């Protein structure tokens, strides 16, 4: 009915219950470099440098840092292809991303294994699958049946 910038954001841009208030000091002290992965989540209590409502859950990479602002590259599908959009936001509307955590853990674990092998220590025994079979000794046995009282 009207193509305003903030149309239909009554629930999107709204603070959670009993969690109102301006940003904290850890947010102010967080450090962002070029090439980091960040999440774009709007803060309703700042109102300066907010992103458009399209970018509220997306993840991107940092390409630019200014005194109080960040530049993020975010993918956007338009018809038959995907664009690379560049948006400028304040530093309060971004948050460091844990999307590569498992990959970095894998790399560290492999390096630790290599160090242990070179040193000569004994590696832990490998895990055993749960899809194998064996003898089952049951402590309790019951009878499964529909009774009269059930209905």
């Amino acid at each position: 009915h009207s193509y305003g910038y903030k149309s239909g954001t009554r629930h999107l841009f709204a603070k959670k219950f009993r969690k109102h208030g301006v940003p904290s000091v850890s947010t102010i002290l967080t450090n962002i470099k070029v090439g980091d992965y960040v999440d774009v989540v709007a803060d309703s209590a700042v109102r300066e440098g907010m992103p458009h409502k399209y970018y509220h859950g997306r993840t991107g990479i940092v390409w630019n840092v200014t005194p109080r602002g960040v530049g993020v590259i975010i993918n956007k599908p338009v018809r038959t292809r995907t664009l690379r959009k560049r948006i400028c936001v304040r530093f309060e509307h971004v948050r460091k991303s844990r999307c590569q955590e498992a990959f970095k853990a894998k790399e560290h674990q492999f390096q630790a294994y290599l160090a242990a092998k070179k040193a000569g220590k004994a590696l832990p025994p490998l895990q055993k699958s749960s899809r194998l079979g064996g003898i089952v000794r049951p402590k309790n046995v019951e009878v499964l049946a529909r009774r009269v009282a059930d209905y």
Partner: protein, 178 residues
């Protein structure tokens, strides 16, 4: 004909976990066409009563139960079926067959004929053979009298398949066509 159901026994468990390192083992009896349907009924009962889904469970064994020698007995079948506008209904009937499987198949056909109930809406609670002095219905009680006898009337006896004919002579056994 031989009965169209079988007597199965399914034994199962929930997969052990850290919160549940020693789960309980249950035993289930069901009359089914094959063991895949037996397992399906088992897991339905387990989910509906014990809050255990098939995707976190274990089946320890499924086997088919053998039957007793052929003897004419009276069977009590305790059964329950569902239909809309009636809710769940539980009924008890006495049958007269040569095995538990036969009695239960009779019960299924009877329920289908008299109440339009189907296999996935029927549930069997208990089946047992009762002595001849515990029968409370005359239609079943009349078959264990000591002097029971009757003739065979209105017999529509046909011919062997190889000897059937289309036209035969009027007062003769001679086939004219076929």
């Amino acid at each position: 004909v031989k009965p169209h159901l079988r007597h199965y026994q399914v034994v199962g468990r929930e997969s052990p976990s850290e919160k549940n390192p020693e789960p309980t083992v249950y035993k289930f009896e069901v009359f089914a066409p094959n063991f895949v349907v037996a397992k399906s009924r088992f897991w339905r009962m387990m989910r509906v009563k014990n809050k255990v889904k098939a995707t976190h469970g274990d089946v320890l064994s499924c086997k088919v139960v053998k039957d007793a020698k052929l003897v004419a007995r009276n069977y009590l079948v305790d059964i329950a079926y569902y239909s809309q506008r009636c809710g769940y209904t539980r009924m008890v009937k006495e049958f007269r067959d040569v095995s538990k499987t036969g009695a239960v198949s009779q019960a299924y056909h009877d329920l289908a004929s008299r109440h339009r109930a189907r296999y996935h809406n029927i549930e069997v609670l208990n089946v047992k053979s009762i002595p001849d002095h515990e029968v409370k219905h005359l239609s079943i009680a009349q078959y264990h009298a000591p002097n029971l006898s009757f003739p065979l009337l209105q017999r529509r006896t046909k011919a062997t398949r190889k000897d059937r004919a289309i036209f035969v002579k009027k007062n003769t056994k001679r086939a004219v066509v076929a």
